[PDB]
């Protein structure tokens, strides 16, 4: 009480943050592109500014935790935290991050197929695995790994973002049981997350297998995980029946298909990530090494 937690409220002052455009609303919050121009000389730096969509007390608390998580991370494949803006006369919070111009990897793969080949896909796979290795060192579980939640800086560099669902593992357990569930990205969830609300490094590995599928399906649209799973379940189904069917499918070895053109060896990596036995899933370190060995073993 006596002394409140450290904050640097003069680092990004709201009067010097100029709104340019909204970049989106989604699972990532409401994010705007702004320019931070403290010298008011139409110089400065374009930044990404994350805001809450519903500023309830609970969401503000969760936002503080997300900010602390992001502040703690420094890695080439993690979107760079810049600071916080205590806007509305220091009665609101906005999160300041670096701006990456190409947006989500999901959108980049659709918009920029002219510059994507399997070599690039494996480079992105490697980078995502290394960022996830780094999260593991902090006992952080991302819980929303998907190409929509990875940003593209340029054709040679991707970075995880969207730490809005990230949790920190209890000191003495290897999983976090989420006991307030909200909207769930069910088609990326491991079976134990669907059936027991249990999240772990190994459930992030399951989701990474879905990301790897997404990368290798990029040539098509009918092939996204939601579309393919709904085709398998039955496109007519609605509501909880969808989840019931997805659980039953996954528990009895139902899986997304090998994308057209995908090497057998890459599909094998996906399949090994999609193991119902949590402990048999590979680690992010196993995956990074295997993917980089595959890359290195090509001719040249
Ligand atoms: C934190 C951050 C975001 C960022 N850049 C972009 C760029 C783009 C691409 N726009 C650019 C302007 O013209 C049209 C194409 C974009 N589209 C959306 C929906 C988002 C929002 C977003 C998506 C995924 C994730 Cl993980 C986090 C997000 F905040 N963004 N965010 N840099 N840093």
Residue numbers in the entry: 833 to 1132
Text of the article:
MPNs are clonal neoplastic diseases initiated in the bone marrow from a mutated hematopoietic stem cell. Structural analysis showed that all compounds anchor to the ATP-pocket of the kinase domain of JAK2 by making two or three hydrogen bonds with the hinge region.
In addition, gandotinib forms water-mediated hydrogen bonds to Ser936 and Asp939. Pacritinib stabilizes a collapsed G-loop structure in JAK2, where Phe860 is buried within the binding site. Interestingly, this G-loop conformation can also be found in the gandotinib structure, where it is further stabilized by a π-stacking interaction with the compound via Phe860. Despite the collapsed G-loop in the gandotinib structure, the Asn859-Asp994 hydrogen bond remains intact, and gandotinib displays low JAK2-selectivity. Despite the collapsed G-loop, gandotinib does not display a markedly high JAK2-selectivity. Interestingly, the binding of pacritinib and gandotinib, which both form a collapsed G-loop, is driven both by enthalpy and entropy. The favorable entropy is partly due to the desolvation of Phe860 at the tip of the G-loop, which buries itself to the ATP-pocket upon inhibitor binding. In line with this concept, gandotinib and lestaurtinib showed no selectivity over JAK1.
